Amino acid sequence: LDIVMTQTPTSVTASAGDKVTINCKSSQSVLFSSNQKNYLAWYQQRLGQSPRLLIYWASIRESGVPDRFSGSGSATDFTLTISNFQPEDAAVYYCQQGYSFPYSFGSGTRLEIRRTVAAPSVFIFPPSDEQLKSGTASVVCLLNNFYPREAKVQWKVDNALQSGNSQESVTEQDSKDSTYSLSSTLTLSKADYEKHKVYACEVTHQGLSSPVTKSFNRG
């Protein structure tokens, strides 16, 4: 044999409050005839975290799990249902069988969230005096609490656009307000940094009517 777990859909996006549904179908019945118990469990995994058990016995809720989360179905077809979908519920959801060996999980299902367009609060940081000691200069640009994920950053050293010396990283969606945060870092050798006065960061997001620019003078 070897039961197979099939999750539907692969990814979902819904507004705060709308009813969310995840389906999981097994290749073989996970219901045990004598105890009339379905061997199915639902889990919620977040980034940089261990999975968290929500539903067991296909319809039983775990202690401390919100009422909105509900387990349903029998034999092969199972369904996890979030009623008042909240920002906290933006995570990966897995279905797991326990009826036979080897144990099988689902492919996972990514739930997402829609929010009002939020403009980024822009911040600029010059390199620290100790970083300088050793012939390097890293300039950091901060794009705090913004939605959608799509945004543009442009470095302008003495009003001359920079290319191929910067790197950016984005955070996962926030559990509370459901926004993003971006960090761009401009890295130059001490000699190149010491050459110029002005250092500008130009941000282009749909939450901003005009491109916001944060700058500084070296010393």
Binding site: K37, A41, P51, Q96, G98, P102, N144, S181, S183, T185
Partner: protein, 213 residues
């Protein structure tokens, strides 16, 4: 409550063998079997096999049989996983989850133990402040380190609201770089003291940088 404490991370060269440990605080052994699930990067969970700590009863999923071994010591309430002939494919997060006897698995899980299969040398990070200049943003730059991860906390963990520890990026040097920030009110800059604790266990590095305006 109940805690399945696994180590944070081990780095081995290819062919070398690791031994993922899992201390079971609790609760208490036994009468709770234990299984091992692995999480490759961005890919789903993959079931490796089980253990009956009662008396070392084991099962392996075909694809893990021959390369893996689960031991358990009833004395220290510690269970293990030993993977042999380490390949770059084996680079994943290894989970220690406690199996409940009815409704199968996994009420309590473990932190993860990233395993990195790399020939490269350990290197401690360089911690630099990101100085602020009615909501101000201050941070820490954890530059040039290997391997991942680094744990950044603020004010010995007392500061949690608005903290954003960014996902680490690979530099041309092959060393990772990371940055951790926090939005605070402008009013607290004169009052409050902000210090980032940085930990890198692979190189045994512990830094506490005080971020000043």
């Amino acid at each position: 409550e109940v805690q399945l404490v696994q180590p944070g991370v081990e780095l081995r060269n290819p062919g070398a063998s690791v031994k993922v440990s899992c201390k079971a605080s609790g609760y208490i052994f036994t009468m709770n079997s234990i299984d091992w699930v692995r999480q490759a990067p961005g890919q789903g969970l993959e079931w490796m096999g089980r253990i009956d700590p009662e008396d070392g009863g084991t099962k392996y999923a075909q694809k893990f049989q021959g390369r893996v071994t689960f031991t358990a010591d009833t004395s220290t309430s510690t269970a293990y996983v030993e993977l042999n002939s380490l390949r770059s494919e084996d680079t994943a997060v290894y989970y220690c989850a406690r199996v409940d006897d009815y409704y199968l698995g996994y009420d309590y899980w473990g932190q993860g133990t990233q395993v990195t299969v790399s020939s490269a040398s350990t290197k401690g990070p360089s911690v630099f402040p990101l100085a602020p200049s009615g909501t101000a943003a201050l941070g820490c730059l954890v530059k040039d380190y290997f391997p991942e991860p680094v744990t950044v906390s603020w004010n010995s963990g007392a500061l949690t609201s608005g903290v954003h520890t960014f996902p680490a990026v690979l530099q041309s040097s092959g060393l990772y770089s990371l940055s951790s920030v926090v939005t605070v009110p402008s009013s607290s800059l004169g009052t409050q003291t902000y210090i980032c604790n940085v930990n890198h266990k692979p190189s045994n590095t512990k830094v506490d940088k005080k971020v000043e305006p």
